Design a binder for this molecule. Structure first.
Ligand SMILES: */C=C/C(=O)Nc1ccc(CCN2C(=O)N(c3cc(OC)cc(OC)c3)Cc3cnc(Nc4ccccc4NC(=O)C=C)nc32)cc1
Length: 293
């Protein structure tokens, strides 16, 4: 069924997309790099590198509605500098193509890891790392204001552009039924359950406050330069640690102020955690006062 309603403000003719090859290492080949010709109505002789999400070969009738929902969700949420933005779509005369912004330097976890000290790439200053935190906070603040709750806020779901702009991804998905499946690992072999707030983990309660918990874990990821939370800790033992009120240790190069921020994000009482608005304001002040040397 490739008869879909057309929204002309977002529509791009298929012969304006030059489809490249799958992004990342290449497992999720449903999303590919591509070149859009004349994406903007102003001078259509300009090419723009973009990312294109399409349906797999064995697409179910609901995987279709899944992608469509994600697309409509992004339309409603609107645009921000620090999220992966919708750019257009191909809905008529062929398979559904959803066109979004492209991130050349990969996810934040990869980005950070590839810039650790020992052909090096780059070394991030202290101001750089706090700046990363600020950008993600600013993105999450916008998403929160649009009543959007992220399902898995983590470094893996933050993407980095050519200009080193942090962009939040996968914020337009739906709460998968119930069965979250706590033992399922990511492609890098980590347990996403270690980013989950306790109330979301034990009572299945998801609020903006649970995202702040996740941002805390993300902050820890940033200042450990892509470090893995709770190495060697299975799901069962994580639960025990959480019930006992255990918290991750302070990263080595991390200032006490920033570690306090993490701990505040990890408050046992959800109402006592800071808001993303607070976090943006604080991180703004810290960047200004953080050394570039
Ligand atoms: C086993 C495969 C593996 O290693 N993982 C893997 C993870 C993600 C991706 C593509 C990620 N991606 C993406 O999904 N984008 C996107 C698309 C939609 O469609 C609605 C919505 C989004 O948010 C709501 C986000 C856009 C996008 C843009 N740029 C990248 N680039 C990238 C990410 C991670 C690693 C490497 C790259 N770039 C390259 O590979 C370029 C050389 N990714 C996405 C693929 C694999």
């Amino acid at each position: 069924e490739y008869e879909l309603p057309e929204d002309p403000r977002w529509e791009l003719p298929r012969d304006r997309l030059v489809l490249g090859k799958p992004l990342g290492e290449g497992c999720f080949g449903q999303v590919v790099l591509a070149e859009a010709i004349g994406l903007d109505k102003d001078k259509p002789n300009r090419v723009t590198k973009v990312a294109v999400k399409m349906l797999k070969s064995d697409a179910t009738e609901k995987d279709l509605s899944d992608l469509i929902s994600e697309m409509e969700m992004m339309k409603m949420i609107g645009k921000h500098k620090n999220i992966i933005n919708l750019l257009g779509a191909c809905t008529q005369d062929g398979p559904l193509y959803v066109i979004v912004e492209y991130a050349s330097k990969g996810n934040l976890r990869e980005y950070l890891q590839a810039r650790r000290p020992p052909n090096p790439e780059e070394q991030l200053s202290s101001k750089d790392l706090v700046s990363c935190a600020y950008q993600v906070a600013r993105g999450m603040e916008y998403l929160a204001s649009k009543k959007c709750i992220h399902r898995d806020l983590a470094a893996r779901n933050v993407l980095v552009t050519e200009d080193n702009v942090m962009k939040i991804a996968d914020f337009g998905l739906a709460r998968d039924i119930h069965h979250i499946d706590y033992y399922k690992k990511t492609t890098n072999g980590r347990l996403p359950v270690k980013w989950m707030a306790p109330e979301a983990l034990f009572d299945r309660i998801y609020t903006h406050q649970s995202d702040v918990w996740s941002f805390g874990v993300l902050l820890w990821e940033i200042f450990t330069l892509g470090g893995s939370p709770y190495p060697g800790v299975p799901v069962e033992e994580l639960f025990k640690l959480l019930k006992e009120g255990h918290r991750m240790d302070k990263p080595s190069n991390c200032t006490n102020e920033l570690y306090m921020m993490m701990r505040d994000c990890w408050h046992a009482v959800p109402s006592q955690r800071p808001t993303f608005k607070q976090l943006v304001e604080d991180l703004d002040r810290i960047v200004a006062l953080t050394s570039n040397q």
